[PDB]
Amino acid sequence: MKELFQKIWQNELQFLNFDAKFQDKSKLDTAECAIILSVNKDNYERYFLLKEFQELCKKIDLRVDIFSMQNAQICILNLFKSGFISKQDLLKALKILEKISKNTEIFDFILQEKVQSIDQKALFQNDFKELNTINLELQKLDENLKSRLQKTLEKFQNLEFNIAITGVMNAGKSSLLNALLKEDFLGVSNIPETANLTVLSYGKSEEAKIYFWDKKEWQNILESSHFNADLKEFIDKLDKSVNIEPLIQNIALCELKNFSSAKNKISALIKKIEIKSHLEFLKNNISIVDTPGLDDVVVQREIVTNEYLRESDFLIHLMNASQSLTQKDADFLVHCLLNSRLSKFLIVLTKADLLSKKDLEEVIVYTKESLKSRLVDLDENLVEKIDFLCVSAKMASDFYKGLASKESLQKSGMQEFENYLFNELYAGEKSKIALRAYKKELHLELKNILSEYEMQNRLIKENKQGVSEENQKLLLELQK
Amino acid sequence: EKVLQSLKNQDANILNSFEENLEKIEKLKQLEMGLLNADKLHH
Amino acid sequence: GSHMQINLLNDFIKAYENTYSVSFDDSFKGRIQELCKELNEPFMHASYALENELKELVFSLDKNVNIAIIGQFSSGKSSLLNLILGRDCLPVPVTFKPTFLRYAKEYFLRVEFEDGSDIITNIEKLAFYTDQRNEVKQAKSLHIFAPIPLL
Amino acid sequence: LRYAKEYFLRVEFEDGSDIITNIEKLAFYTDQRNEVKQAKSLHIFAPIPLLEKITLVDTPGLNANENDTLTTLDELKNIHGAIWLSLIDNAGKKSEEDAIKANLELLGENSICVLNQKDKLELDNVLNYAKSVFLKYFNELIAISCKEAKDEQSYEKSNFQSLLDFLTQLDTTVLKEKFVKRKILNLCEILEDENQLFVGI
Ligand SMILES: Nc1nc2c(ncn2[C@@H]2O[C@H](COP(=O)(O)OP(=O)(O)O)[C@@H](O)[C@H]2O)c(=O)[nH]1
């Protein structure tokens, strides 16, 4: 890549050693790396005179000299190769920055370069069991501290990754969930009426705990029926079958075996179904939240946004390959983009069949342009917050037991989607944040143990000093 | 001299306790470097 | 925060754009001078004093037109200044603080000292602050404020 | 706020020019416009003792900003002391942020802490002053509270003459000298940093 550096630093290029001199490997995030890469020899004086760039370089521990800039670029590129910190998201960030710096050469080099082995989850398990071993050693050497360490280990062992998944109804989410789990579960048949939330968790018991509306939630639904005029019709159809005789305080049914009588218009009285199933996917301590799209507006949408705004550590949104942006879907995606808490949610174009490949990419481009048009400022770059996958659940479900026993598992996308979801358990920000919290806890318990054990030595030294003083007093008494 | 000898007898067990504490401190020192390395690996 | 990453990038873009890329209130001289001075200052590594001089020249367009009275050995410039002021101040030369005639609604004098401090005081005292002393704050400049049009 | 024999305001503008004017116009020059000369600074001249050689500088509101203090320091300089004004609330947040603010930089060796607004409420006040004593030894001499006058016939139990008396009794010269010593030590430290960098190369 000496040719690349000659290209971008034509005459001000200096004598430099092409390896990553990096000292921390987390010294700067990927957007800051992209900024550093865009200090091409034509913008370099302006960048160096810019106060915000100087603040950035003081944050990173860089100078504004040319040599150190080029050295940092080298190290960034070597980490991009070896430690493989940057995705195509680095390329995204450089495209974003091209507002200022038209840095084509570095962009192309990052594009066309053999990347490396990735190896994420193995590294995650190695680091986590390192930390477990450190916790064990701390437990060895106080009772309160050992109990604290044990509680911390219990907290960080087998902990709660929640995936919310959403989309409009005809687009189809239950079928995609079936294909991900590689067997059937609630619902594969499209029906215009609907709704209740479904929480797929993991446990030894195979419950199907059910929750109905409260008296007040039902009163709110009947209130809104006056305004909706389709909900009013449905409520009129429902109240003929008076299952009200679904009441004041607590409705907790504990078990069922796939009874389809609820499809006969009673699910409208259910709000929340809490499943504890046995599937290895969930055996990895995952929990999925399936969500309605449009029905029973009044409080089923409120409980949907409760479940999503709650723990949910990730968001997947589904759209069928041939939907014309589904105005409600577009409004939801806009709300997602403006929410600064969301931090790079995911999109799946479901039913990847029924549509020619390389036409699916045009559909994605259309989607992104629409989302940009709803956000007219540098706000547009927020659409680069979204990742896009193209999976078809029918082919994957067919390969397991159905018609297409000839290999449709690949050429569908389910395998890649599964890889993505598993990668979000080290690469996802949540896993790294949990590791950082565990490290801080270990440091603080270590500090407590230091405070405990140095005081014993101090007391022993004080006792020795007192013994010496007593000996001196005895000598003085003998002299007297 | 007798008091000094008694203090030496007690300062055998006291010396052993101090040496154990020193080894604990050295182990904790090792731990902190290890923790810093683990942090460094993260990104 | 990847949303915060995008926001950081956008902030950098906005800051660079505001510092190096903007056209002024053009179509009139006032800010054509600003465009010229910006031309003079991106990489052409300017001296800090040149930079300050250009800034002051830019300001001069918004400011009091400074017109100076150039007198001879003793050509009666002080009495002319008195006539301009209406009230009079010292019509013999033992010499010189730089003196300014500005506008107010009352007759007072503003004495700017070398140490940086100033004082606002009565115009009668002007003579005392002209004539030197031994060990009190030597005035750097004298600022007569008078309620005269043309000031 | 500096000293004069009459009431003035001196409005120093961004472009360098100033104007000396009547103090009634103060409000006008506080409230900004779009393209009227943006005021760089405001200079009240008033015939009050204690403005003889101890002039006052008004500072912004502390709008819950951790990095406000350093920016303020960079903006505005040599300060010999200050009067920290606070309402009845003296929670830990105020203590910590006060510590990061003053930090020997801006307030303390001698500078004052002042609780306001006694009048809207004592045993409670006694408890609060004790809390301030052990909490707020950052500031040097005694923590103090009050304020009412001017349409009060009493004119007092506003402890206002206590604050006034303190402001009078400051040994100004000592403050100036210590400040200068501190600044010169800072500069020496910086120069040594630079020199050692070169040596290291
Ligand atoms: N070709 C294809 N069709 C699908 C797939 N998943 C669902 N469908 C069809 O799309 C419709 C909606 O699917 P559905 O299971 O009801 O999802 P839901 O509406 O969210 O409950 C059904 O008629 C399915 O037969 C898929 O992966 N490929």
Ligand SMILES: Nc1nc2c(ncn2[C@@H]2O[C@H](COP(=O)(O)OP(=O)(O)O)[C@@H](O)[C@H]2O)c(=O)[nH]1
């Ligand atoms: N007879 C006469 N005396 C004048 C005239 N102009 C100035 N003077 C006198 O010259 C003396 C010095 O005046 P002054 O204002 O101090 O001159 P300056 O030192 O140049 O400012 C005064 O006594 C004036 O009265 C004039 O036209 N005729």
